[PDB]
Subunit: 597 residues, 3 copies
């Protein structure tokens, strides 16, 4: 009768054990010690309790769910998905996750240690799915929370390579739901056509959710795929750190973004991106303001490495009928980003920062301010016409650039004949270094092309570090752009031979509170008088000039033009030079024109 | 007789096992394999060896200690604190940790994998405690070391919500002691009223101690609590990375600091703080110099996100009778910090950097230098009068600010009628961007309020990015502040309408080695002479001016004032203008006054 | 007969188990559950299957290899190296790793959890070795890959303290080989004389290899050791993060480097270094271009803390007969670095950045560009003559410095009579702060010593923050250095008493596209005329000057020199001053000389 017990499933519960023969240790049974761990093998069995080998013809979903449900009932634990095996999923889950096209329901305090591989079976080909779902209701607004759920290990989630069947479908790897202290660490997500790999939170509900040391490889593969963002961070106090993102499909270059940060106190740091269209969206959607309020603040994008084809960071905020989204207190620092090799205009417009209009294309709903962009490097190959430090395409209430290195076609850009952004508090510090890769490519183009409705309380301190005589101007304001309470300067270095430096097509530099300086060539003529003698400009376009000074040597012995000039009411410049010998003098001089500076 | 063996505690030691039926594998017994792991269950038993269920009426302390002591005796290992259970602690420990109000003694090479919850029982209500202590003696100076002790997992240390019983009491979570290669990873510390959560090292003794991916939630809850700093780093080559700190109590806004760094080669990176008074102290206490010397150098505070109510980083050093503390080689970079919503003066003075007097209030003991503050963003709401980029309240031997974005009431501040710091090597680079949130709030106030005993070898390059005509001045030096061998400039942008820009109440700008430029309005009158004609200032307050130039347009046709001016011995300005027609001229002009620049 | 089965090695395979008595769980045997884990104990046995205790007289190599080989055959898993034991290695491995002096062969998907200690036995004294090798062939070009191999834990690899027997020998800890998704985490490598601790990849072959939270302690100890670099990163999309490196040997101060990055998309972040010669090499060796191409781009060195004796980051690229290496798109940011206490010239030349000639000493093979060095702090003690922000010793095609704090002897340096680098696109922004530690030490020395063949498209904006009248000049160009299309400025602050500020020994500032300004003292004399009167320089060395302005006060009542000056064809300066009373005037004035700026 003892033999029967020992060979029964209660057998281990009759074999005694004491840790290391320590007489001070608990007198236990072997089953107690084995019960301290749990794996999928403990649930991957047929109705008679016989273990089933996983494989492409076995659907492991019900067994994994049984494991999760059971461990949940004991207050949690960690289930191991064993190494050396591929565990296939081949059906949809039931109940609360069915509304989410869910496969597996995650549960609070039940962690998954994925050491083996989880593969999607062809049941999912051309269909929607979300592999792991933390919602417990079809309607997220009526869902309970997921808490203390961690997925980690050296294993792999493989989406089977299946294309989307229709653009309207959604696909996800891990949707944590209304998620508090949940995380994914170490996992490789690969070989799919999905909308997201991981979503965190739901419309501001959730906290302390993180993606760390994960890899995401080849997760877009078709023209059907409407849009892809690898990680969507939709709860506060959450972020993505030390991850690796790679795409190889041409479609990903037009549709894929690595991360989005959609709630306050979120971050994206220390990650490497290759083959994506975009780096990160940093936005406040009014529609997503329920859980954590209508402000996305304390947003951090730092120390990432990227090769992308479109825009690195996209800023935005928008409104609904009853809620207004605001984006403020953002830092973008220490990133090194390039636009990968491509033809001009062959992917979305290349940019380090984009101020993006809302999903309906509106440029007059945004409330974006207190952004710092500092200590980044950006590069686009010389052929890429559509490359800018910032594409400023919607209303901006402030963005500050200090000590970056931007090596691309444009510094500030917006297309003419499109949006007319209202710009406030745009600061471009003199410590921004403008690279020379695009020198000689800029025929017909303005380095800072200020195609806006208006600019106020802004600073543009242009500093070249090499010549580019191809450009039409360093900075141009069309007559349609109002300019007030602003500082616009062009340093003279490398500008001696430029026909135009700063261009104000509406004469906007004459504004009462516009502070400007830039180089210009000026023709002057003197009076005949021997001795101290006035020189006057021939042209009368300098009524706005407070002072000017020589940027040219004086090749003459018998006279010298003035070193410095002021203006007169008729718009001439005037200064006092010296005629060692008398005579009317005529000179053409390069001057630094100054207004209130 | 076999049956009896099998059911005995030696039973598992008689059941044979060979790994995966591999004939090349060791012929072992089941007990050998089970002996490869160890958990609290192996020691959580009564004197007859019967397992005891944990719970609020069970004190688990002796069992956990027995586990640690035993594993220590075998050269170490990792003890699991099982998931799905709350393990309560309800008594003090004995021996060497009793002097520290210790509960559990940590031991070298014995790691704790906390997957479940550790809770303090109400025995500890109103009492001191340190939950885990690595010292082995009541007197730390006679304590051995703790080495290779790691605490990690998804579990929780809960301090039971109990208030301090008296302000003089101390409470701690983990005190590693004289600690070498010790760490805490993943753990949540919550629900208390404590002095610290984690301390590392002891007075410079220790090395390579780290806190990573931990959460600290609601660890101050009473008015009795004297002071709280979540992590106190008191050994070199140690730090805090990727942690989350949150407080909700009003008291924490006045008393709580997230981290202190007190020894060389220490760091605080990539963390998020909410609801605290302070971010980090970075200090060298002479009293703590025994283990690692009297210099705190290589101190790093980077890439943190914070909402705080007082000061973000506090710098300091101090002395004892025989030892002098020095703080140097510090970097504060990439942080994004705001003062949270509060009334002016309702918490300690808001600051990004504070130069803090010693614990006795002395401002003349410090030796702080070679600090770099770069690429940070700081914001305080417009109502918060008590907000500064730096509150400079004690002697400073150097601090360098480059390429930050500071959006608060003051840039440099110290209160008048308090300390008179001696300031050396304060560098404020022109690349620091001054935000506009507090525009129009600054009536009676100086943006840079230089309330110091003296300033030497310093640079203040003031650059506005919007108008604020409410401020009394951009920078003011009271007559009591000596100023020498320094550069002080105010860029003209947004200053045209300011009555005062730079103010030197002791005429300190006249110093031999003071280099200054700022805008001013000057009245001039010319001689009557037709032709080249001198203009002279009516006032005689410009004996210090080396050159000046026009910041105003000339509304006249018949004459022009000089574009540039020098001075005369009587303190008038003088320049040569031009009278097309003769006559005495009188003008009021905005000039850039320059001295040696 | 049952008893015999139970005591046999198949015994555990006859004892039934069901998880937690769950009737829905798999009916398993105890051996199935034990088979879910594996340790070295399962293979550390004699030929009769009896377990062998590890120790200094036991060679564990064959047993560890048997474990790896076996687990490999089942598609992988994790082998534990148990805590509380030291496992000695005392022989070389056989087959494919013998060509690499290999001890253990790593295999794909077979992870090692090192909790105990692995020690080298004295068999290896004075011999070469590589402890863990991922190559499967003696010739790497014919080797298969290593994939999904992770080494982690709290354990230790100890190299036994043995010195190298000959300089030509190689020693390594982990050579992952042609390595894809491999990593080392948590491990301490200590007590050796080795070439490397860890190498990643092979000549560009490999991907996603990482070293995280590892310690490296005392890995150089002899004069025989030819060269040491702790981690050599030789595959793309790979890096080193949050590690600790320490050396105590004098030899390490001359030969040891913490990291090298040799392929694209690699990083070195968040680490602490003490006692090393060098921080990191960042290079493209043409010889290593097979796997990932001939460009090292997207290279990141950030947020490290270092005390070193030579150079922090060394940049380079080189060629073979058929391949040319290129280095571009590099960011060095947020690092805090000092040269440790040492005598001048007692270790390799101290530098933050070094542009290093190739291994044959050639300075004309490099293609280095698009480098950003920003937001770092560097310090060298005042006695260390051989300390520079950059030692620019080979051809440079671009490097940009913004918003750093450099406190050392030289800013830009190269030795005269050595290499004559061709320099292009060197940008030194005005936001770089120059510390004062070396003030008064610079007799005979130029702060920026431009000992190059030529300089083009470069910017040097010199800004002092304290006086140093000991220096010969702020910046000097020898006559042998061509200078064109460049901007060179010296801010006047702290320069009033300097005899020389900028020195152009070949009069190179006269170039058509050279833009310069610096202070100078100039003697002038006026004509006798009462009224507006010309002042002329006595010297004729200013044919290149476009304008000049006064940096001196005018101590006179009866006259004033000109505020501003231009030049004449004979090289005199000329300006119009004012004689209230007539008379020839003679003055010596400090002027800001300007050319095209
Ligand atoms: C793929 C992606 O992230 N694209 C973003 C875009 O996001 C929006 O489009 C999406 C397209 O997939 C998502 O849209 C769909 O999914 C919604 C959510 O699904 C339901 O709810 C979930 C919880 C459930 O499991 C499902 O079963 C569904 O029931 C659908 O409602 C919708 O019909 C789909 O088209 C995305 O929705 C969000 O998804 C996240 C993550 O799952 C959820 O947490 C949110 O609840 C949900 N949000 C809402 C409002 O429903 C859509 O948000 C972003 O809009 C843009 C951001 O950029 C654009 O706007 C900014 C700000 O104005 C501008 O600056 C830019 O210029 C402009 O382009 O970026 C895309 O990459
Ligand atoms: C809470 C906190 O960290 N506050 C710091 C403040 O720290 C000092 O006050 C503390 C208040 O709790 C600690 O003080 C007490 O604890 C001491 C240590 O306890 C004994 O020793 C330990 C090892 C043992 O386990 C215990 O059982 C006790 O026997 C007591 O001696 C003392 O009486 C208590 O009030 C703190 O002490 C240090 O604690 C750490 C961590 O445990 C130990 O490693 C150190 O050994 C110990 N140090 C000493 C000298 O004993 C006190 O240091 C800081 O002083 C300030 C820093 O800021 C201030 O100074 C700087 C520099 O001049 C200025 O710039 C600032 O302006 C100024 O405010 O910050 C507080 O937040
Ligand atoms: C120690 C170190 O890293 N020093 C670097 C230096 O590296 C070069 O010298 C090395 C000295 O140890 C290595 O040289 C030897 O090892 C080679 C590789 O060994 C064979 O192949 C391996 C795979 C196998 O396991 C072994 O059994 C051997 O069969 C030997 O071929 C050679 O004879 C030895 O001297 C190093 O080699 C590389 O090693 C890595 C890591 O193992 C491998 O992945 C590479 O395949 C291998 N590379 C090659 C080409 O074989 C040598 O590269 C660096 O050269 C310098 C960099 O700095 C210098 O150059 C730059 C760029 O021009 C300049 O800017 C600098 O100014 C200049 O100093 O730095 C040293 O610290
Ligand atoms: Na749905
Ligand atoms: Na997207
Ligand atoms: Na979008
Ligand atoms: Na308009
Ligand atoms: Na005590
Ligand atoms: Na405190
Ligand atoms: Na304090
Ligand atoms: Na004084
Ligand atoms: Na070899
Ligand atoms: Na080396
Ligand atoms: Na070398
Ligand atoms: Na030359």
């Amino acid at each position: 009768q003892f033999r029967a017990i020992i060979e029964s499933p209660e057998g281990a519960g009759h074999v005694g054990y004491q840790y290391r023969r320590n007489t001070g240790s608990t007198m236990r049974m072997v089953s107690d010690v084995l019960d301290e761990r749990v794996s999928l093998w403990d649930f991957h069995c047929d109705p008679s309790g016989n273990v089933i080998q996983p494989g492409p013809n076995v659907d492991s979903r019900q067994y994994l769910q049984a494991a999760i449900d059971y461990v949940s009932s004991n207050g949690g634990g960690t289930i191991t998905i064993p190494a050396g095996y591929t565990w296939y999923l081949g059906s949809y889950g039931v109940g609360g996750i069915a509304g989410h096209s869910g496969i597996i329901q995650l549960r609070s305090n039940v962690n998954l240690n994925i050491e083996g591989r989880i593969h999607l079976s062809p049941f999912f080909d051309l269909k929607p799915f979300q592999v792991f779902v933390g919602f417990d209701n079809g309607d997220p607004a009526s869902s309970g929370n997921l808490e203390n759920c961690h997925i980690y290990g050296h294993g792999v989630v493989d989406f089977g390579g299946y294309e989307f069947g229709a653009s309207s479908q959604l696909r996800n790897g891990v949707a944590f739901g209304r998620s508090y202290n949940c995380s994914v660490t170490g996992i490789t997500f690969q070989n799919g056509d999905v909308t997201w790999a991981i979503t965190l939170g739901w419309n501001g509900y959730g906290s302390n959710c993180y993606v760390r040391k994960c890899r995401f490889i080849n997760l877009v593969n078709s023209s059907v795929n409407a849009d892809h963002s690898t990680v969507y961070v939709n709860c506060p106090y959450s972020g993505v750190e030390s991850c690796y993102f790679s795409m190889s499909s041409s479609f990903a270059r037009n549709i894929a973004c690595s991360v989005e940060l959609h709630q306050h106190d979120t971050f994206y740091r220390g990650s490497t991106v290759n083959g994506y269209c975009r780096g990160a969206y940093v936005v406040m959607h009014a529609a997503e303001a329920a859980g954590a309020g209508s402000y996305a603040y304390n947003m951090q994008v730092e120390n990432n490495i990227a090769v992308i084809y479109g825009q690195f960071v996209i800023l935005g905020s928008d409104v609904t009928a009853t809620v207004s989204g605001h984006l403020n207190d953002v830092i973008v620092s220490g990133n090194i980003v390039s636009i990968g090799e491509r033809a001009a205009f062959s992917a979305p417009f290349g940019a380090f920062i984009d101020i993006g209009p809302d999903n309906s294309g509106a440029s007059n709903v945004q409330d974006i301010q207190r952004v710092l962009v500092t200590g980044n490097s950006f590069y686009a190959p010389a052929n890429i016409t559509d490359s800018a430090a910032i594409t400023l395409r919607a209303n901006l209430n402030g963005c500050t650039f200090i000590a970056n290195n931007f090596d691309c076609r444009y510094m500030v850009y917006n297309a003419p004949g499109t949006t007319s952004p209202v710009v406030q508090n745009l600061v471009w510090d003199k410590s921004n270094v403008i690279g020379g890769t695009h020198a000689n490519q800029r025929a017909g183009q303005n380095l800072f092309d200020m195609q806006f409705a208006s600019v106020v309380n802004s600073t543009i301190e242009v500093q070249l570090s090499c010549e580019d005589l191809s450009m039409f101007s360093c900075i141009l304001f069309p007559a349609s752009c109002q300019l007030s309470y602003s500082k616009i300067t062009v340093d003279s270095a490398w500008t001696k031979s430029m026909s135009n430096t700063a261009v104000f097509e509406g004469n906007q530099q004459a504004g009462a509170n516009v502070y400007v300086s830039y180089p210009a060539t000026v023709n002057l003529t003197s009076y005949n008088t021997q001795g101290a003698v006035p020189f006057f400009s021939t042209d009368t376009n300098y009524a706005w000039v407070t002072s000017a000074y020589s940027l040219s040597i004086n090749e003459n012995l018998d006279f010298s033009p003035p070193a410095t000039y002021t203006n007169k009411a008729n718009g001439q410049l005037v200064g006092v030079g010296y005629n060692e010998i008398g005579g009317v003098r005529s000179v053409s001089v390069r001057l630094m024109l100054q207004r209130q500076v």
